[PDB]
Amino acid sequence: AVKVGINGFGRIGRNVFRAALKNPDIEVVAVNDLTDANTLAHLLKYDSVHGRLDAEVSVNGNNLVVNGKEIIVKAERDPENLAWGEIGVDIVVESTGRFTKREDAAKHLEAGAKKVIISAPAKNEDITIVMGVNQDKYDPKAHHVISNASSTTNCLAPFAKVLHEQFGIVRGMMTTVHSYTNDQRILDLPHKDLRRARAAAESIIPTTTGAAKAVALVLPELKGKLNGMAMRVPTPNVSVVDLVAELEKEVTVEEVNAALKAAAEGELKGILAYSEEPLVSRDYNGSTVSSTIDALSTMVIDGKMVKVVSWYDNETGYSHRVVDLAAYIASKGL
Amino acid sequence: AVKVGINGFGRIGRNVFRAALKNPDIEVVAVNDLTDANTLAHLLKYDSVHGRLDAEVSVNGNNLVVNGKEIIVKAERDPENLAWGEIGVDIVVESTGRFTKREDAAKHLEAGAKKVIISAPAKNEDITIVMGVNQDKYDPKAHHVISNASSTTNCLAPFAKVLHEQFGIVRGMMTTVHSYTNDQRILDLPHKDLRRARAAAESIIPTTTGAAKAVALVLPELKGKLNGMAMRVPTPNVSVVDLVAELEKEVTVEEVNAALKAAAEGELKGILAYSEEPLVSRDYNGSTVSSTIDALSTMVIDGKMVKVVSWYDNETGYSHRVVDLAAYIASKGL
Amino acid sequence: AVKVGINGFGRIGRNVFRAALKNPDIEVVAVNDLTDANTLAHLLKYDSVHGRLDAEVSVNGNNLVVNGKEIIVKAERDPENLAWGEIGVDIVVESTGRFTKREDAAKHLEAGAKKVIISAPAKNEDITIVMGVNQDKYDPKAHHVISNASSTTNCLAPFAKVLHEQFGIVRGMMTTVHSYTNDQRILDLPHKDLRRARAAAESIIPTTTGAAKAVALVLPELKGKLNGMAMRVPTPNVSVVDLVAELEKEVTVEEVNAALKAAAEGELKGILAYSEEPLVSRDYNGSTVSSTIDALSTMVIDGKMVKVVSWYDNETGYSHRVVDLAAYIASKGL
Amino acid sequence: AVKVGINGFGRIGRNVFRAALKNPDIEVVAVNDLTDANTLAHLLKYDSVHGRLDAEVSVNGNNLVVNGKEIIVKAERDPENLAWGEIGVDIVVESTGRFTKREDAAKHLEAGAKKVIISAPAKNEDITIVMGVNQDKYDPKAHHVISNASSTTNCLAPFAKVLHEQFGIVRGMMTTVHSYTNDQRILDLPHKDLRRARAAAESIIPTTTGAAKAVALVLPELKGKLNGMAMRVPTPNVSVVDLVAELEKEVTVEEVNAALKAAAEGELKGILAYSEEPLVSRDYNGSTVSSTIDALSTMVIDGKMVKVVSWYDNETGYSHRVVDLAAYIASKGL
Numbered sequence A, B, C, D: 001a002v003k004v005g006i007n008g009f010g011r012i013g014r015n016v017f018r019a020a021l022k023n024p025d026i027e028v029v030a031v032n033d034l035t036d037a038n039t040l041a042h043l044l045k046y047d048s049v050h051g052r053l054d055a056e057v058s059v060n061g062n063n064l065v066v067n068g069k070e071i072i073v074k075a076e077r078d079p080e081n082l083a084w085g086e087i088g089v090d091i092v093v094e095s096t097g098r099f100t101k102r103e104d105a106a107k108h109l110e111a112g113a114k115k116v117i118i119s120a121p122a123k124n125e126d127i128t129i130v131m132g133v134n135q136d137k138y139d140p141k142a143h144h145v146i147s148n149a150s151s152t153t154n155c156l157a158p159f160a161k162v163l164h165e166q167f168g169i170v171r172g173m174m175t176t177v178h179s180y181t182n183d184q185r186i187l188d189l190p191h192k193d194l195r196r197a198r199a200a201a202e203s204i205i206p207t208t209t210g211a212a213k214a215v216a217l218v219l220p221e222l223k224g225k226l227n228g229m230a231m232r233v234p235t236p237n238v239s240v241v242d243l244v245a246e247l248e249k250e251v252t253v254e255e256v257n258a259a260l261k262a263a264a265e266g267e268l269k270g271i272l273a274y275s276e277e278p279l280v281s282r283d284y285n286g287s288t289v290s291s292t293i294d295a296l297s298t299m300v301i302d303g304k305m306v307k308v309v310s311w312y313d314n315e316t317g318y319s320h321r322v323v324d325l326a327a328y329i330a331s332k333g334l
């Protein structure tokens, strides 16, 4: 249906491309990075985390060919020169990691695009959306630069929503044991965050995160009630959220898990999932949901303080949410 | 001073041996395992985690020779046949992982020993001690099978003590992101804990832990107020405790860190430490304290809910505590 | 058709089971290990290396149920008590790693089985076979305890055959950079091999191997012509053979590769593969062939010394070969 | 005595700095990178691979202070603007990895330095040197931009020299199982080498290397006699050379080892080492020699083909060699 362009064909860029292959409402016609079609084709075909792509992938001189279709490969460091209007691109997925500020992301619009989905927390965005939580707050007439938040926020918000609406959250704190990402370093290198400067595959690395705070963007009633941190560990993908919260209503572990399960099988199906299996991170690689409750970990003290643990494939779940968001925005009119 | 024997010359066994080398009050004269002196000597000399031992290590036919001294090497699967009385051993460090029940640990006494320190949570022990917290509760006349608890409990209790005495803990929950240990598995193998059965170096592995509950053993006032879980990750050593707690007194981050720092430089010096540095797990390898507060991570909401993060070398800190406990018990009379 | 039993439902056992699902000629009716069906079913369903099993898995009573097919679960430590005959099991895959000596493997025959396939180099076996190299040497009348060799030998032998028959091998030496296995240790523990005693995921670990010499078992002409070693590294699966050999005929890189490619698409199709893609180990996880030539790495000096590098998923390839051998044996008559 | 400047205060830069602390003949007075002193001081103080620096470290103004000695911190991306002459820097260690071509390295000379040591294989350098092999070929009058080669070449060359002079090398091929480096990628990213583009800590990664051919630069007699490759694996530091060579003289394993041991305790003392211990990579972290023979791995066939395996801490050994070379050059007159 709607033509989409991907700026930054990396971990999210290529995983969003995979998800798009399954969505009839969106079609990727062009991708932009800092290399040649031959390199991008090779990366799209062989993935160290998700295995070989199940699709026809080859190179057509200067472009990529996936399942017969031809994808235009651009190599423009400056977004202002992407010329999206010339190839009919209406929605651009901004996933380079360098244009999270609206002043920069808006360049895609100047280039002919109509909507821009920043694949991460943004600065001065028209609106931040978490699919399954507040997409209804989207305004096709006033929202042009949209943020799909972080995958961590996408994992916490859905179950934070359930807990609050059913029991009411007084306050809480979270920690996400998160797989390392390309924002880190291989061997002790300069980084604004002296924690992230350290060898990623060698340590448990505490680092900041605004995921708990960002929840308020999508769930206003929780403004100022949540905070958190992250701990980057030596795994290449899949992360887990650990929330400890004080509730208003007196509850038991059974009632908490029951409510989470009902929501996973109800209105949040596909967004929130519920698992009573004693699994580990490798088990969620490839998971497409935004959040899967590890029911066995649910814990309660004095019937007021609760611990909820939820899994998430930070690359896959979020990538599918980006696609869902692209399709939703499209169904509202461009 | 007092002659000590080590049953199970593994990670804790050999690290306790290192610590003992620095303690004038204790002397290791014999070690028992399931192999030959040649293998134990090689393991004591080259350590994948802590580097080459700085000491003279060789083999004397059937025994080990460390810095001129000769250590008797035993290979008795059954503790009942250790004959500690024949070699003057008064205190035995039970660190095989197979004799945590008093009925089994007591065998060391039957063999001629006077005291037994189980290097882990135990069953029916005469008393569980956390150095710096409740060693005063030790009774030389009635306590013969002692548990030094877990390293996780040894990391949480000291700062749990401070928080409670200064602000009062209503209730709290913890999660320890812990390095993998030999209790896990290399590649998906049977294990009572289906979580721990999974490849240790490949996933983030949630697992049970009684560390939060065990705190009550050493801090009675906290009985039933704390619970927790663990998440085993792909690091070979060093772990971190993440405690979220509701306090009685209204506080600020500054006051919380101030109290922790004062205690680290005061009565808990050597047991509890305080760090304002943005470090990572590799930075604590070799740390001898039981708990080091990561001050930068301290967080507070509504002045009542607090998050305290503390580091610990699960092998080194605990091993030194085992030695401290051996010396303390000795100073009370055998 | 032929009923098969698996003794040692571990890394190779389970992989064999999955491979068997593809061959309608062999039916796995029972498996034996040292745990309960609940545990074996859980391990079979979720694999840290190969992902989630694409089949229904449940536990019925004290047996496993895969896609509705019931599989008997035994938990007998002593092979003499397996009673294979009682359930019509004619072929047993011995993959415990504990019964490689014929006197032990032969216990399965005493228990009623007609043929035993030892999933590893053996001692006093009636014959060692490498599919695609010497299966024709199997003699149904005299061979009852068969060895399928090691995964390393299954990788080397096929292309070693091609090099010798096509160019003649004077002598050669190989090194296999191999993923760690359950024979190693998590954190420095006793082991007959002081090298494998060390933390598997923390070092490059040089270790010995008879894979180079075992090739002579299946290629008698190469007796005394090859030798080698292994280097275990921090990866959970997939390994690679690196052979340096002196050839008789003077050749060029193109010639050597042309021959290997010819054999891969010809006589060794399904056993030996040929790739001109610049891939890495993760790309071969799940590979069902015994050996894939990494053509880009082919090297020649003075037209006499050549280097050939070949990939192999040590768990999957060998396990599929095990099933091929079982079917082969059955077709020869039991 | 001689004032030295380090350009690129990374893995090699910092290791060089630490090595320099041991040599009173060279004084590092300034370092340059792309960040601030606060960041460089933090990196120098806490190392994920080599531990905590055993020295006082602080930041005075905008400079570093190590054990009271002040070190100028520069942050100039363009070497022409380093003004080395202005601060009396005569020798510059070029370790950014960006200036291996002489036209770039020569910018340090334009800036006032008298000699430049490129910490890697170079292009159009006046001469490439491997301490203990060809330092005598350095000519103070004509050599201003010098290359210290690669760490792999520094490991191979020394024992290759011994084998050729003692037995004569017909031809050989090597493979270095090498730890990952900052030249690789965390998670599948663009890279000129499609192999190094892949997740460094997740695979065994075959890659090319000129180390085998570069040995000819320092051992002209071996021109056209050697070639090889590298295999990057999931370890943060320490690598190992695996050489398979055809010799002229017929020898035995004992002979080959006897010669290597003789050279290690003789002419190559401090450069080449000899070990008969069954060690693993972690045991060599911190090793200051360029090459340590793993004698237990020595292999011989037909008394003509030999396999020699040698260990090397790729960061430390080379960095110490860099300091040796700087002192050597200085002693030749500037």
Ligand SMILES: NC(=O)c1ccc[n+]([C@@H]2O[C@H](COP(=O)([O-])OP(=O)(O)OC[C@H]3O[C@@H](n4cnc5c(N)ncnc54)[C@H](O)[C@@H]3O)[C@@H](O)[C@H]2O)c1
Pocket: A007, A008, A009, A010, A011, A012, A013, A032, A033, A034, A076, A077, A078, A095, A096, A097, A098, A100, A119, A120, A150, A151, A181, A182, A314, A315, A318, D187, D189, D190
């Ligand atoms: N990886 C995750 O777990 C995750 C999850 C959710 C959101 N995110 C967010 O998504 C964004 C991308 O993250 P990632 O992990 O995919 O990073 P990445 O480094 O894997 O991919 C970024 C890609 O953009 C390219 N690039 C850089 N500058 C460019 C430019 N000027 N023009 C065109 N291409 C350019 C790079 O070459 C690379 O291919 C970030 O903002 C990040 O915070 C990451």
Ligand SMILES: NC(=O)c1ccc[n+]([C@@H]2O[C@H](COP(=O)([O-])OP(=O)(O)OC[C@H]3O[C@@H](n4cnc5c(N)ncnc54)[C@H](O)[C@@H]3O)[C@@H](O)[C@H]2O)c1
Pocket: B007, B008, B009, B010, B011, B012, B013, B032, B033, B034, B076, B077, B078, B095, B096, B097, B098, B100, B119, B120, B150, B151, B181, B182, B314, B315, B318, C187, C189, C190
């Ligand atoms: N590793 C840690 O982080 C840590 C920290 C604190 C406490 N602990 C506890 O300490 C104990 C030991 O743990 P570890 O990590 O040292 O384990 P380990 O496996 O490294 O060491 C155990 C040693 O005991 C030996 N052994 C087994 N059975 C024996 C027997 N019957 N007789 C004599 N020797 C025998 C083994 O050969 C081995 O050398 C456990 O109870 C554990 O829970 C572990």
Ligand SMILES: NC(=O)c1ccc[n+]([C@@H]2O[C@H](COP(=O)([O-])OP(=O)(O)OC[C@H]3O[C@@H](n4cnc5c(N)ncnc54)[C@H](O)[C@@H]3O)[C@@H](O)[C@H]2O)c1
Pocket: B187, B189, B190, C007, C008, C009, C010, C011, C012, C013, C032, C033, C034, C076, C077, C078, C095, C096, C097, C098, C100, C119, C120, C149, C150, C151, C181, C182, C183, C314, C315, C318
């Ligand atoms: N892993 C590889 O890459 C590989 C490849 C080819 C061959 N092999 C060989 O196959 C064998 C098994 O290797 P693995 O990696 O699958 O090992 P593993 O440790 O993963 O599996 C062995 C299984 O046998 C069970 N077991 C042990 N003793 C038993 C007994 N007495 N009775 C019944 N069950 C018992 C264990 O519980 C376990 O599940 C070895 O001989 C090995 O050398 C391994």
Ligand SMILES: NC(=O)c1ccc[n+]([C@@H]2O[C@H](COP(=O)([O-])OP(=O)(O)OC[C@H]3O[C@@H](n4cnc5c(N)ncnc54)[C@H](O)[C@@H]3O)[C@@H](O)[C@H]2O)c1
Pocket: A187, A189, A190, D007, D008, D009, D010, D011, D012, D013, D032, D033, D034, D076, D077, D078, D095, D096, D097, D098, D100, D119, D120, D149, D150, D151, D181, D182, D183, D314, D315, D318
């Ligand atoms: N790491 C090893 O094992 C090893 C061994 C021997 C030689 N080398 C070689 O040494 C060089 C550096 O390797 P490394 O592993 O230390 O790399 P690194 O990436 O760890 O360090 C390079 C440093 O240079 C800085 N830098 C980059 N561009 C700069 C510029 N224009 N001006 C000033 N500073 C800049 C970076 O910020 C970084 O701190 C390379 O040529 C490499 O091949 C590496």
Ligand SMILES: O=C[C@H](O)COP(=O)(O)O
Pocket: A120, A149, A150, A151, A152, A180, A181, A182, A183, A314
């Ligand atoms: O998954 C959580 C965030 O989206 C991670 O962002 P990062 O690219 O900074 O790792």
Ligand SMILES: O=C[C@H](O)COP(=O)(O)O
Pocket: B120, B149, B150, B151, B152, B180, B181, B182, B183, B314
């Ligand atoms: O450090 C915490 C516990 O002591 C770990 O015990 P474990 O041997 O079961 O890993």
Ligand SMILES: O=C[C@H](O)COP(=O)(O)O
Pocket: C150, C151, C152, C181, C182, C183, C184, C314
């Ligand atoms: O692939 C090589 C062998 O099959 C490894 O056997 P192992 O179980 O002894 O490691």
Ligand SMILES: O=C[C@H](O)COP(=O)(O)O
Pocket: D150, D151, D152, D181, D182, D183, D184, D314
């Ligand atoms: O040790 C080998 C080389 O020094 C590696 O250089 P690199 O930085 O290109 O990985």
